[PDB]
A paper describes a structure:
The folding and insertion of β-barrel proteins into the mitochondrial outer membrane is facilitated by the sorting and assembly machinery (SAM) complex. The SAM complex is composed of three subunits: β-barrel [name] embedded in the OMM, and two cytosolically associated subunits [name] and [name]. The seam where the first and last β-strands of the [name] or BamA β-barrel meet is called the lateral gate. Unlike other β-barrel proteins in which the seam stays statically closed, the lateral gate of [name] and BamA is flexible and required to open for function.
Residue numbers in the entry:
A (entry chain C): 1 to 84, 104 to 181, 233 to 421
B (entry chain B): 40 to 111, 126 to 512
C (entry chain A): 16 to 132, 140 to 333
The structure:
């Protein structure tokens, strides 16, 4: 276990429920050895990077967040057992990597998160099945809200995601066609013909595409469009899953010999309570906005310190002293205003 | 009555929260009045009654139970204090547009008549209005009052197809003279922001959209000699509002010297056949205003920026020259109602009582002949504008104001006449009239149908 | 009731005068003989029609200059926009008191086609499926780098204050509020970017520089610039996709490369101490300098008269 990848729990018959986390798992399986890495089921509040997937390089005790950063870090610091128009292929991979993170992600949000009918039947139960008991009431609301903001520019809403229906389906088909048309040219199957992309881009493409096809949903508009109009992309996803992730990725080196047992390492009674209360604190009006910002900056320094940098110390001591002064003046005012004799008397006499 | 008998020792009930210093500054001169010892009941009995109203001005005591007792010559006065908190979370009627008013009030803080009123409002034409005010008398004088107010409101301007966001603080020094006038010197530093432009917004509104700060020192003088402010049937009213912004020590994005006056009056007429109060009166009104651009600095000579839509005057409406849409007078860019720099509005009405109804009733019939003008300053008079625009020298501004004032005299002013009924409700005046525009300029909006107006100020 | 009243209501008013003249400020700005494109610029720059410092406004300004349309530019703010954001176009007044409806950014190309000064198909032609992927390198990878460096980076604090908050108001209090809002807004966008954001902290979006990975944003821009240089190297012409004239793709890239060289090209002394290459230097060093020549060629077509574009 040279490195440990913190990802979401398995769902929909896939090793992870997140497109980026699933891509990171696929990249490690093909390149890294079986015993070199470990998969740990986690949540954004469990890792100091506040982002999933997150890699913890135990060799240097470094926290790396994001799929692009994880792949870049591995190339610069290859593990002992690592096996990853030449410039055109590299340039194409960069272009499609940015395209997937910018246009494929909002499309996936509409099918799973923005659609209230779809979210409440498949996505929401899946998230609760991979979290300790008090968390599904705080984390999925945050994930859905962030994912809904990603698909905000798409222009569609929950009502559209399913005569009102005579053009509602047209917008859904048009939005899916724009994203899927670009991806169909790449020919991710690595067969004869078509463009050629790096291994990292192929893993990222599968992560987004698998979450639009495999999940069984009450409103499978995306699955019908993908199968009906793009058989080549549907074939690629099934073939990739059947090889990289047989029987739903049960041979992956999950920590503690299981997907759910892996999360128990950082899901103790105290740790879970601390994660839950922090989420509640951020919702307190006019103070959460300030607690989360303080907490985000505190965790940012922790990640930067792990990377080898030397962040400047903060002024937390000054705020602590300043907070104490605020209590003293408030307490003095209460002690003075309350408990003092009345300013005037009931009977006032002048000679 | 004429018997000399000094009051000497006196005692006041119900002063358990107000400091003795507040009462000492009010009742000590009453004691010194008894030193004359000549016709006391003709001189000190009126003095206590005169000074009784001084206590009611602090608003700390309940005016309902303001009883006064008599004895021998000790004088006992019994008063009751108001509630220390009054969360008057209610709506508004007279100010119908006033929508709701969750006015919370902390009264009598620190013993003196201090008051922290944290009002909050939300309704039509005003998305939100949060006001925090702290008022306190100076040197124990109820007439002289000092107030510090912080506000953050987002008003709406449908006539100009935009909304204004206000954020600033004010420092007011209100004063009531012995004659009855009300001086008020206030310093304001607000941050105006024009946002929420309508799709039909004129280019003038778009050009003026943005952020600006106004640091101004304004003085208000009011002399209300009318018998009834809601239904003026006798007396007169003179109000003058002068504001200086951005000049000298005041720093801001706007620099001007705005002055607005207003003179009203009413003359009762008596029917020879009828006896007593006939109820028929003939009134009038006249409002003037000048907006003079000024440079930024301590010099009166220099380049001055033209006025913006935030500061320009707006004329027309039920509280303005009637017969026209709200802001229906002055320059109009397309459909938006841009403001003007100078204006002059007049009114000639005649209140009449309805038949078979006593004159004491608030209901009256009014026939008005409201008229007004509103022009905007421009640099057409100057020979040639420099390369860097929006910068008029002292000569150009002075010539522009003279031309603007001269535009008022030539040509018939925008005139509308009509009849209607007026309700003199004490909180606010309600008026419903049938108007008919007679003379107006092209692009101005006049209403020929029924017009409903409610408020405290009318022309 | 309506019919008897209508025959009398048209009698009034009796006298109608000419409309009142508009204010001086309105008469000096809104009056003109050419369509005015409102962009983020300075008073001196707008006089010569120099490129705007806003990448969003520069993209549309460049396209209008490639469409031979005769127009002028005037500095403005996002509040005056018909869509809530610049740029936008106001056609010249037909009457001193009446003006046509404003043209939004989306309709800019349609307006330029109706007022020749033609065949503007290349300026708005649909891109091939492969070219759509490379477009995401500009609208997402390069945009986040510009937003992070201009707003979140304390190094460009003086530039950000001078470009945006200084002309807004002279009040030191309002300027501070505006700076806070600008940085908070930029942080929300750079956060909706799997390149360097994606952190989940609460039910509200991340609006601070501490919730954004600067290294990931910087690395994505460096990869994007190399990829875009390779794509241009494939073309046999001086433009993308082997076109004889610049199109929408070139204007989209020029709106970022020009501003990076003009403003973000700092001195090597600061970069050496910081250990990070500036945005302007990466543009010149991308590939074999292909992106540097493209910016100069794009300037030499849309702004042939300008000669102070070095930095
Ligand atoms: C949301 C606010 C009101 C906070 C303060 C309230 C928290 C309480 C009510 C919640 C938070 C965590 C919850 C909790 C966590 C885990 C379990 C284990 C389960 O086998 C029995 C219920 C139990 C014990 C529940 C009971 C209700 C608890 C204790
Ligand atoms: C006993 C277990 C098995 C389950 C059924 C019980 C759940 C109840 C009793 C408790 C457990 C967790 C609690 C819970 C968690 C978190 C929040 C978020 C907070 O902002 C509102 C209250 C809310 C939503 C509370 C409500 C009460 C819940 C839902
Ligand atoms: C004695 C404890 C350690 C045992 C019962 C452990 C309980 C577990 C299930 C944890 C999981 C979530 C925890 C939890 C969630 C949130 C809160 C709200 C806080 O305001 C009081 C504690 C409380 C209620 C704690 C108590 C301990 C809980 C319920
Ligand atoms: C009667 C005494 C007490 C003295 C002091 C009061 C005088 C004032 C209140 C009276 C005297 C003459 C009145 C007067 C005369 C003529 C007119 C013209 C009319 O179109 C409007 C009202 C107006 C302007 C009224 C207003 C009220 C005035 C000015
Ligand atoms: C609006 C700007 C120009 C500010 C500075 C206004 C200043 C003038 C108009 C104000 C400032 C102080 C005021 C002032 C001070 C004191 C008194 C004594 C009182 O018995 C009569 C009024 C009088 C004389 C008033 C008149 C109006 C004055 C002179
Ligand atoms: C239609 C408008 C023009 C009407 C309301 C006019 C109002 C003004 C002109 C009236 C209102 C109050 C009047 C006023 C009040 C009191 C007095 C005292 C008296 O000893 C001399 C006249 C004098 C000074 C008059 C002059 C005229 C005034 C100032
Ligand atoms: C008090 C006695 C001794 C004498 C002098 C007073 C006479 C009054 C009735 C006279 C004196 C000045 C007159 C006066 C002055 C100016 C104007 C302004 C004009 O637009 C309306 C009439 C009005 C308002 C008249 C009304 C009648 C007034 C007020
Ligand atoms: C503001 C109030 C007082 C209302 C009544 C306004 C009245 C004034 C402005 C009106 C009333 C009568 C009008 C009047 C009567 C008759 C004529 C003859 C015409 O060939 C030129 C205009 C002229 C001279 C106009 C000018 C405007 C006047 C003088
Ligand atoms: C430049 C030279 C040639 C001459 C014409 C200019 C003189 C200036 C300095 C004078 C002329 C008119 C004056 C002027 C007119 C009117 C007012 C309104 C008043 O409430 C405040 C002062 C103010 C604003 C003054 C300020 C000084 C001005 C502007
Ligand atoms: C002031 C009261 C007592 C009464 C008499 C006034 C009535 C007003 C409404 C009447 C009287 C004279 C009328 C008047 C006179 C002359 C003209 C010239 C004409 O080309 C336009 C209408 C106009 C301007 C009208 C408008 C309405 C006026 C001004
Ligand atoms: C120190 C205490 C007294 C401070 C933090 C105030 C309140 C405490 C009790 C906390 C505990 C649970 C919090 C709480 C739970 C859930 C929600 C739902 C959310 O949609 C609005 C805020 C709200 C309603 C917050 C408000 C603040 C509460 C009620
Ligand atoms: C408060 C104001 C708006 C009231 C009193 C109305 C009018 C005032 C301004 C007076 C002042 C000068 C007057 C005036 C001057 C000269 C003429 C030229 C003549 O051929 C028509 C009437 C006309 C145009 C009149 C109309 C009434 C005017 C415009």
């Amino acid at each position: 276990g040279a490195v440990q990848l913190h990802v979401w729990g398995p769902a929909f018959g896939l090793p992870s429920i997140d497109a980026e986390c699933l891509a990171a798992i696929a990249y490690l399986a093909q390149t890294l050895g079986s015993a070199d890495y470990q998969l740990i089921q986690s949540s954004p509040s469990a890792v100091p990077t506040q982002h999933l997937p997150t890699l913890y390089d135990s060799r240097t005790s470094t926290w790396i967040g994001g799929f692009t950063s994880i792949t870049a870090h591995l190339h610069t610091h290859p593990p002992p057992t690592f096996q990853s128009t030449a410039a055109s292929a590299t340039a194409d991979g960069t272009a499609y990597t940015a395209f997937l993170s910018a246009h494929a992600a909002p499309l996936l949000a509409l099918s799973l998160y923005v659609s209230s009918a779809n979210y409440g039947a498949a996505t929401r139960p899946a998230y609760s099945a991979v979290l300790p008991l008090p968390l599904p009431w705080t984390e999925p609301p945050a994930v859905r809200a962030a994912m809904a903001r990603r698909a905000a520019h798409l222009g569609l809403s929950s009502l559209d995601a399913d005569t009102p229906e005579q053009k509602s389906r047209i917008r859904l088909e048009e939005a899916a066609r724009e994203v899927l048309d670009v991806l169909a040219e790449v020919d991710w199957a690595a067969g004869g013909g078509g463009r050629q992309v790096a291994a990292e881009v192929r893993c990222l493409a599968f992560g987004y595409l698998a979450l639009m096809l495999l999940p069984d949903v009450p409103r499978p508009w995306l699955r019908e469009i993908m199968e009906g109009r793009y058989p080549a992309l549907c074939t690629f996803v099934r073939d990739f899953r059947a090889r990289v992730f047989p029987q739903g990725g049960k041979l992956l080196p999950w920590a503690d010999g299981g997907a759910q047992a892996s999360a128990s390492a950082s899901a103790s009674a105290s740790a879970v309570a601390l994660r839950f209360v922090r989420a509640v604190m951020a919702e307190v009006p006019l103070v959460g906005e300030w607690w989360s910002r303080w907490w985000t900056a505190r965790k940012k320094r922790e990640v930067l310190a792990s990377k080898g940098a030397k962040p400047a110390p903060s002024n937390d001591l000054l705020l602590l002293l300043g907070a104490g002064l605020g209590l003293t003046v408030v307490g003095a005012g209460v002690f003075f205003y309350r408990g003092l004799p009345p300013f005037g008397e009931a009977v006032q006499v002048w000679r | 009555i004429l018997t000399p008998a000094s009051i000497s020792t006196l005692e006041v009930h119900g002063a358990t929260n107000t400091r003795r210093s507040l009462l000492d500054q009010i009742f000590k001169p009453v004691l010194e009045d008894t030193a004359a010892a000549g016709t006391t009941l003709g001189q000190v009995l009126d003095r206590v009654g005169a000074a009784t109203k001084k206590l009611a001005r602090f608003d700390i005591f309940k005016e309902e139970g303001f009883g006064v007792f008599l004895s021998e010559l000790d004088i006992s006065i019994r008063v009751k204090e108001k509630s220390r908190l009054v969360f008057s979370a209610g709506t508004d009627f007279g100010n119908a547009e006033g929508s709701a008013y969750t006015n919370a009030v902390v009264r009598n803080i620190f013993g003196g008549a201090e008051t922290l009123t944290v009002n909050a409002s939300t309704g039509t034409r005003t998305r939100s209005a949060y006001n925090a005010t702290f008022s306190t008398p100076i040197n124990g004088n109820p007439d002289l009052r000092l107030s510090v107010e912080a506000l953050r409101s987002a008003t709406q301007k449908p006539w100009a197809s935009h909304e204004e966001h206000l954020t600033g603080a004010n420092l007011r020094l209100a004063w009531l003279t012995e004659k009855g006038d009300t001086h008020a010197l206030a310093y304001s530093s607000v941050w105006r922001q024009l946002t929420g432009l309508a799709p039909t917004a004129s280019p003038t509104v778009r050009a003026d959209a943005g952020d600006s700060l106004k640091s101004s020192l304004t003085h208000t003088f009011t002399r209300d000699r009318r018998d009834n402010p809601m239904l003026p049937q006798s007396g007169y009213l003179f109000r003058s509002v002068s504001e200086l912004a951005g000049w000298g020590p005041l720093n801001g994005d706007v620099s001007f010297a705005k002055t607005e006056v207003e003179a009203s009056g009413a003359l009762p007429v008596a029917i020879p056949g009828l006896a007593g109060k006939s109820g028929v009166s003939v009134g009038g009104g006249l409002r003037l205003g000048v907006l003079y651009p000024l440079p930024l600095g301590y010099s009166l000579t220099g380049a001055a920026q033209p006025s913006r839509i935030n500061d320009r005057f707006q004329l027309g409406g039920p509280n303005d020259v009637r017969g026209f849409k709200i802001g229906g007078l002055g320059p109009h860019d397309g459909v938006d109602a841009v403001g003007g720099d100078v204006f002059a509005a007049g009114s000639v009405n005649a209140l009449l009582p309805l038949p078979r109804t006593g004159p004491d009733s608030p209901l009256r019939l009014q026939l008005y002949a409201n008229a007004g003008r509103l022009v905007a300053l421009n640099s057409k008079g100057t020979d040639k504008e420099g390369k860097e625009g929006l910068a008029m020298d002292s000569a150009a501004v002075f010539k522009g104001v003279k031309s603007a004032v001269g535009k008022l005299t030539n040509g018939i002013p925008s005139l509308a006449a009509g009849v209607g009924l007026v309700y003199a409700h004490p909180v606010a005046r309600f008026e419903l009239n049938f108007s008919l525009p007679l003379v107006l300029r092209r692009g101005e909006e006049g209403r020929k149908g029924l017009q409903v107006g409610v408020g405290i100020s009318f022309l | 009731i309506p019919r008897p009243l209508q025959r009398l209501f048209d009698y009034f008013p009796l006298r109608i005068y000419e409309p009142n003249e508009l204010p001086e400020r309105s008469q000096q700005l809104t009056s003109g003989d050419l369509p005015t494109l409102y962009v983020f610029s300075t008073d001196s720059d707008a006089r010569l029609g120099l490129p705007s410092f806003n990448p969003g406004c520069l993209k549309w300004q460049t396209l209008l200059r490639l469409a031979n349309l005769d127009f002028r530019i005037l500095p403005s703010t996002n509040h005056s926009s018909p869509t809530g954001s610049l740029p936008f176009l106001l056609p010249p007044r037909t009457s001193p008191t009446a003006s046509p409806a404003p043209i939004p950014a989306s309709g800019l190309l349609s307006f330029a086609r109706k007022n020749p000064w033609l065949d503007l198909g290349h300026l708005d032609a649909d891109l091939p499926p492969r070219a759509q992927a490379y477009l995401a390198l500009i609208t997402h990878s390069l945009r986040n780098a510009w937003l992070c460096a201009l707003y979140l980076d304390p190094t460009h604090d003086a530039l950000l204050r001078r470009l945006y908050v200084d002309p807004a108001s002279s009040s030191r209090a309002v300027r501070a509020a505006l700076l806070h809002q600008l940085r908070r807004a930029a942080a929300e966008q750079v956060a909706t970017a799997s390149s360097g954001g994606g952190k989940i902290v609460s039910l509200a979006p991340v609006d601070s520089a501490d919730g954004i990975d600067e290294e990931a944003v910087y690395r994505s821009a460096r990869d994007a610039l190399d990829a875009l240089a390779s794509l241009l190297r494939e073309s046999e012409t001086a433009w993308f996709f082997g076109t004889e004239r610049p199109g929408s793709f070139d204007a989209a890239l020029f709106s970022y490369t020009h501003l990076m060289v003009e403003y973000m090209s700092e001195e090597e002394d600061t970069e050496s101490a910081k250990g990070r290459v500036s945005l302007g230097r990466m543009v010149k060093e991308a590939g074999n300098g292909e992106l540097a020549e493209h910016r100069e060629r794009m300037l030499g077509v849309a702004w042939p008269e300008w000669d102070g574009y070095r930095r």
